[PDB]
């Protein structure tokens, strides 16, 4: 049994590597989600994952894809590591030393607690990351940031130390929904697949059920993610509150606009989870001895 420090360090390193690997998918999702915040020409410049990526690299440069990387790295160091270490610790505490088999409720509760703790501490990195990813020189509001640390300085000096935590409640809602949906859907799918013996009770069935659960969770959490992206990237004094933004989005475009960039978000979720899990397990096994 590895100690707490080893688990935390391995989790941090794995999270950082996974975030470094698959950032352009997040950039494409952010670009697609803020496409129609304000009225513009009838011509849509972004359409398709590969199309959006190639347009971004061809027009705004190759380094625009990886804008705001230090903010993501700081978020992974400060938020993800604590989440995926204290999740295991709290889960063991709830189980009370392998007294009983881990029930669904215990895992759900531990995940919700660790997700809330992770979201509350480590919000400014998310805010700055969204601000940097959504900005563009050619169209939209004038770019006001010149990097990541400059964004911190500008927000601290102009807005203060309480405007950095904007939009924490959408993040909490997104985390709770994604966690609960993932767990419930995976459990139900695996149970049904095993009961009807359509597939063998081996790792292929588990992997297929996990992928289905991840897709369902991404599909359910996409609207709240859209609202969060549109609210966080907004000049002060424009949006009154989150419900106002939701009503404006519904009236201006319609319900279909609530599902934007679903494919890039799902791809990022799957890739990040797989890479993080593999690297974390391998590094923990290597460092335990």
């Amino acid at each position, epitope marked *: 049994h590895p100690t707490l420090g080893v688990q935390l360090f391995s989790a941090g390193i794995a999270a950082c590597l996974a975030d470094v690997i698959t950032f352009p998918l997040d950039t494409a999702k952010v670009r697609l989600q803020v496409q129609g915040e304000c009225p513009t020409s009838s011509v849509i410049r972004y359409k398709g994952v590969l199309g959006t990526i190639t347009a971004v690299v061809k027009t705004e440069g190759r380094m625009k894809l990886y804008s705001g990387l230090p903010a993501g790295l700081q978020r992974q160091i400060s938020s993800a590591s604590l989440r995926i270490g204290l999740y295991d610790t709290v889960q063991e505490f709830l189980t009370a030393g392998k007294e009983t088999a881990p029930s669904l409720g215990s895992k759900i509760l531990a995940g919700l607690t660790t997700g809330g703790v992770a979201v509350f501490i480590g919000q400014p990195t998310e805010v700055v990351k969204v601000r940097l990813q959504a900005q563009s020189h050619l169209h939209g509001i004038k770019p006001r940031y010149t990097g990541t640390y400059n964004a911190y300085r500008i927000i601290a000096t102009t807005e203060g130390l309480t405007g950095l935590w904007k939009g924490t409640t959408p993040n909490l809602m997104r985390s709770v929904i994604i966690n609960c949906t993932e767990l419930v859907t995976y459990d139900l799918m695996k149970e049904a697949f095993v009961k009807n013996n*359509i597939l*063998a*009770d*081996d*790792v*292929p069935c588990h992997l297929v059920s996990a992928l289905i659960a991840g897709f369902c969770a991404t599909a359910m959490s996409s609207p709240v993610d859209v609202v969060k992206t549109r609210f966080i990237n907004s000049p002060p004094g424009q949006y009154k509150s989150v419900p106002n933004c939701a009503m404006k989005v519904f009236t201006n475009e319609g319900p279909t606009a609530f599902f934007k960039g679903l494919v890039p978000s799902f791809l990022r979720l799957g890739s990040w989870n797989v890479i993080m899990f593999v690297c974390f397990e391998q590094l923990k096994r290597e460092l335990s001895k």
Partner: nanobody, 127 residues
Framework: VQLVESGGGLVQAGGSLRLSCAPS????????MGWFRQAPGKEREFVAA???????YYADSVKGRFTISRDNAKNTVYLQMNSLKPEDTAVYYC??????????????????????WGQGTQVTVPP
């Protein structure tokens, strides 16, 4: 792995037989196991198989009579016979395989996936 069976003998019709199969070391908890029988002057056939998770799988001609189970603490697979008949007189082998190879329920029938085969025990039911 030095996987060894036990429980051989000759018994009368209608009896119940308890067959044990255990490997060396403590690697039984991370393996899937299966029982395959060969009739006198015949090739191997599918009898039963239990995966690492713990879901048993039975053959078409053996359903309802066999009962397979595994013990992690004892680290062995135990097979229980019911309503045994001379038609089931054969030599039984237990095979072990690493998890993750099988993708279909019928894929357990293939004998190529298994790699570690034991000595086996001959069970006879004279008429």
């Amino acid at each position: 792995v030095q996987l060894v069976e036990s429980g051989g003998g000759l018994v009368q019709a209608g009896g119940s037989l308890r067959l044990s199969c255990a490997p060396s070391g403590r690697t039984s908890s991370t393996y899937t196991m299966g029982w395959f029988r060969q009739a006198p002057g015949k090739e191997r056939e599918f009898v039963a198989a239990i995966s690492w998770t713990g879901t048993p799988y039975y053959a078409d001609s053996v359903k309802g009579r066999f009962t397979i189970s595994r013990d992690n603490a004892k680290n062995t697979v135990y097979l229980q016979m019911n309503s045994l008949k001379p038609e089931d007189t054969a030599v039984y082998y237990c095979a072990a395989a690493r998890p993750g190879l099988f993708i279909f329920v019928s894929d357990y029938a293939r004998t190529a996936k298994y790699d570690y085969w034991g000595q086996g025990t001959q069970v006879t039911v004279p008429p």
